[PDB]
């Protein structure tokens, strides 16, 4: 449903935003929320500090910098902390993610990670990529590769 | 004597009970406790049917089907005493027996499945279904086609059929809100052709209509009228 | 000793394992390793049930059912030791066993089928269905009526 | 697992009943806002056929002003 071949203003901007994380991730984090950073929460705009690509991608690049820096080796943990903040809701999940207890993270954090690990790199990548296979040797199908053509 | 460490449904799934069974059969065949190879076979085929029809048995069986035993002079692996086909049947039975020996597991999984087919968002049913497929791999660790792995298959291929309708109901909701934007765009174009010096009416009953707009109601001008004034105020 | 080159589910579909089985049975009957023709028959009927209930077995069977073997003085082809009807049942089983021995194949094919019945354009579901009928011919190479060839028929 | 399937429909029929009674409150709120923009000295019509419409309100009927008219008088009487 997505590719890295088509280039637009997005790829034109994240080339420097990643220099001020990863261009491959920052191109993908924005795509999933706003097709081609969509900080929809009013508090996320008051805390992150709108609809201008000069700072929106610059806001995501700053958060994803610290989120991918708070552990420096867990980029899937970073993408999770992005759409699941560390206050009163993400703390029970993020402490349950490192222990490999993906059955107790969220219905939205898993669906988010499962869509972005194809371009992101984590040590728990191959452990979530097979989190829910039909057989323990199987691979659980994420939401938008089993629901691909339905539309 | 096998019901000492092969009945406690938590003492099967341990990884030593496989070694206990291998050592039992071996030291019984060697030290005369099990005299006849026509009798160690009955002990195998009765301990496997005790451990298959019992919660915790699928992984004990999958662990023991790789240990070596020597019967009738020919040495082999327990997956090969019993045939390949018969071992497949055995593991299927050992996985699906812990769902009709206790009805709490059957109740629980069926209710999670069904309350996962009734979530409003079809994309948020799929992670529930991966959750179920993750709590099945803790009770059935072999890749055979147990009937619970048929619940999950029908659930997934039911959620796809649900999304085929939910997407139709979302496209019919972006059809009635792109109409109500087409109408404001055409009304603006009419006002602009009238302002720049061209003689075309601007009553709502005289706009053009092309199946992207529909018939113009009165409230599709009020909406426009309060939206040019709103935009002109913001300049 | 047959589980050395007839169990690895990629070593069955090779085109030499048929020759390995033919040479095993022949040189066992000739060089006394397999003494009795009432025992080479049991080796046949157990190696075929090992190779039929195992991923990769349908094409090994379809390859071996044309090799020559001599039992009870009468020389024949393995499709004719076992009857015609029994060979049909055997190949049906050997094709449909690799879809209930692993549930990954069953899951995958059923989901592609169902996500092919839910495409909006009915003309673009048909090429998806020819795709499925093209990835079934890689696991079931004989023309019997396996239940997966019933999925595809109901899908069309 | 049949009662769950029944509640999936009963909840849909309760959300369609809080959709037609939140519309009929949106309309009174927007009519009040129109009267208040007209009172505080601004030139916007207050006929029911000239309110704004945004799919949270629908088209305004006449009886959605009668209802409002008997409800300001009812509120002003209670002060």
Swiss-Prot record, chain A:
Region feature (Transglycosylase SLT-type domain): 21-85
Localisation per UniProt entry: Virion; Host cell inner membrane
Highest taxon, organism lineage: Viruses
Active-site residue list: 33
Described purpose of this protein according to its UniProt entry: Component of the cylindrical core that assembles on the inner surface of the capsid during capsid formation and plays a role in viral DNA ejection into the host cell. The inner core is composed of stacked rings of gp14, gp15 and gp16 proteins. Following binding to the host cell surface, the internal core is diassembled and gp16 is ejected along with gp14 and gp15 into the infected cell. Gp16 probably inserts in the host inner membrane and remains associated with gp15.
Assembly: Homotetramer. Interacts with gp15; after ejection the gp15-gp16 complex composed of a gp15 octamer and a gp16 tetramer probably binds both the viral DNA and the host inner membrane.
Family the UniProt entry places it in: Belongs to the transglycosylase Slt family.
Domain comment in the entry: The N-terminus contains the transglycosylase activity (Potential). The C-terminus is essential for the viral DNA translocation into the host cytoplasm.
Protein's UniProt name: Peptidoglycan transglycosylase gp16
Span of the entire protein shown here: 4 to 177 of 1318
Curated annotation (Swiss-Prot), chain C:
Localization per record: Virion; Host periplasm
Coiled coil: none
Record text on subunit structure and interactions: Homooctamer. Interacts with gp16; after ejection the gp15-gp16 complex composed of a gp15 octamer and a gp16 tetramer probably binds both the viral DNA and the host inner membrane. Interacts with gp14.
Family to which this protein belongs: Belongs to the T7virus internal virion protein gp15 family.
The protein's role, per its UniProt record: Component of the cylindrical core that assembles on the inner surface of the capsid during capsid formation and plays a role in viral DNA ejection into the host cell. The inner core is composed of stacked rings of gp14, gp15 and gp16 proteins. Following binding to the host cell surface, the internal core is disassembled and gp15 is ejected along with gp14 and gp16 into the infected cell. Gp15 probably remains associated with gp16.
Protein name, UniProt field: Internal virion protein gp15
Species the sequence originates in: Escherichia phage T7
């Amino acid at each position: 449903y997505d590719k890295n071949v088509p280039s637009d203003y997005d790829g034109l901007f994240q080339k420097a935003a990643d220099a001020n994380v990863s261009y491959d991730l920052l191109r993908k984090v924005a795509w999933t929320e706003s097709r081609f950073m969509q900080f929809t929460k009013a508090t996320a705009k008051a805390l992150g500090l709108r609809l201008n690509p000069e700072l929106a991608i610059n806001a995501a690049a700053k958060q994803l910098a610290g989120l991918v820096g708070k552990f420096d080796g867990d980029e899937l943990k970073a993408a999770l902390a992005y759409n699941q903040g560390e206050g009163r809701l993400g703390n029970p999940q993020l402490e349950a993610y490192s222990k490999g207890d993906f059955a107790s993270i969220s219905e939205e954090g898993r669906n988010y990670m499962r869509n972005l690990l194809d371009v992101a790199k984590s040590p728990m990548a191959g452990q979530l990529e097979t989190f829910g296979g039909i057989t323990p040797k199987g691979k659980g199908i994420p939401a938008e590769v089993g629901l691909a053509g339905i539309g | 004597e096998l019901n000492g460490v092969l009945q406690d449904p938590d003492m099967l799934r341990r990884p030593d009970s496989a070694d206990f069974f291998e050592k039992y059969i071996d030291n019984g065949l060697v030290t005369g406790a099990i005299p006849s190879d026509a009798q160690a076979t009955q002990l195998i085929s009765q301990a496997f049917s005790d451990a298959s029809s019992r919660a915790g048995g699928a992984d004990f069986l999958m662990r023991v089907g790789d240990k070596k035993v020597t019967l009738n002079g020919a040495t082999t692996t327990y997956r090969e005493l019993i045939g390949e086909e018969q071992w497949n049947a055995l593991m299927v039975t050992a996985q699906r027996s812990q769902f009709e020996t206790d009805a709490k597991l059957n109740e629980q999984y069926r209710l999670k499945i069904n309350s996962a087919l009734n979530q409003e968002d079809p994309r948020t049913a799929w992670e529930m279904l991966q959750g179920i497929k993750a709590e099945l791999d803790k009770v059935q660790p072999d890749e055979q086609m147990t009937p619970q792995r048929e619940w999950l298959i029908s659930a997934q291929e039911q959620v796809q059929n649900q999304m085929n309708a939910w997407t139709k109901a979302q496209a019919k909701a972006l059809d009635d809100s792109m109409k109500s934007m087409n109408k404001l765009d055409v009304i603006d174009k009419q006002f602009q052709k009238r302002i720049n010096g061209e003689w075309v009416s601007t009553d709502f009953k005289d706009m053009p209509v092309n199946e992207n707009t529909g018939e113009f109601k009165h409230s599709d001008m009020v909406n426009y009228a309060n939206k040019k004034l709103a935009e002109i105020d913001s300049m």
